[PDB]
Design a protein around this ligand. Structure first.
Ligand SMILES: [Zn+2]
Lengths: 274, 6
């Protein structure tokens, strides 16, 4: 560095960068209408009463969940497939895959919008789990996500047909291990020649510290409302921050890359099917 | 792992 956003676009265009790893958080889904935790006003920090929560993280904590699983299953009902749609930031990542640049997309989101936008499962690491499947909390029987959908849509807590235990969708709660696919980080992060970080506060580990695992010559490009994490206090010479709305930062990168019309056509065709 | 704050 010091690099600019235009410098990074030129490394991509010169094919100096061919293997992009991406890390994303809830801020890429707020334009789709899904509240995050930390945004002023709309974030869960500011809307505890709506979900009946003592604080926002309780919604992903097992002791609170077993005491009262209802706040969690309200969110599950909102977030179950079919309700929210991917926005331009998702279709940008889809285009990055279609253009041969995506080594892997690590996400902390549980809205499933990366898959809905058409990125193959093999390119995705849903690090904090998924509503596509569920597990009995007592006997550990696995279930497809559709098997509990009716109960979820009716506000009934899903129960196991074998032991009557609560059936919990496979979303990683505080203190639980991330999925085995998360281990791909061991070979993905040394191999990355670019790291893109979008829409996250970098406040949850071990996901957050992945920003540290790329080689010191790799640029890290943050597109976020604010500067965050290992980035904001362990700065490196090739880090680039594009602060502002996430979609505006992505639009500005897409235009420097030469991809605007193609992105617009992709979005039209994808969102119009449903 | 596991998942933890901060
Ligand atoms: Zn069971």
């Amino acid at each position: 560095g010091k690099l600019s956003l235009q410098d990074v676009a030129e490394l991509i265009r010169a094919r100096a960068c061919q293997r992009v790893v991406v890390m994303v958080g809830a801020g890429i889904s707020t334009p789709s209408g899904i509240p995050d935790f930390r945004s002023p006003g709309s974030g869960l920090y500011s809307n505890l009463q709506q979900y009946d929560l003592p604080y926002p993280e309780a919604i992903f904590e097992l002791p609170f969940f077993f005491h009262n699983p209802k706040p969690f299953f309200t969110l599950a009902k909102e977030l179950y497939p079919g309700n929210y749609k991917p926005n331009v930031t998702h279709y940008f990542l889809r285009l990055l895959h279609d253009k041969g640049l995506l080594l892997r997309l690590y996400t902390q989101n549980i809205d499933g919008l990366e898959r809905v936008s058409g990125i193959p499962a093999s390119k995705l690491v849903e690090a904090h789990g998924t509503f596509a499947s569920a597990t009995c909390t007592v006997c550990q029987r696995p279930f497809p996500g559709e098997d509990i959908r009716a109960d979820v849509m009716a506000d009934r807590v899903p129960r196991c047909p074998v032991c009557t235990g609560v059936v919990k969708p496979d979303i990683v709660f505080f203190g639980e291990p991330l999925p085995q696919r998360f281990l791909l980080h061991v070979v993905d992060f040394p191999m990355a020649d670019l790291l893109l970080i979008l829409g996250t506060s970098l406040e949850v580990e071990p996901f957050a510290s992945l920003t540290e695992a790329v080689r010191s010559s790799v640029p890290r490009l943050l597109i976020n409302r604010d500067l965050v994490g290992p980035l904001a206090w362990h700065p490196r010479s090739r880090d680039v921050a594009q602060l502002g709305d996430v979609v505006h930062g992505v639009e500005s990168l897409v235009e420097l890359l030469g991809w605007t019309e193609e992105m617009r056509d992709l979005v039209q065709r994808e969102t119009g099917k449903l | 792992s596991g998942k933890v704050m901060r």
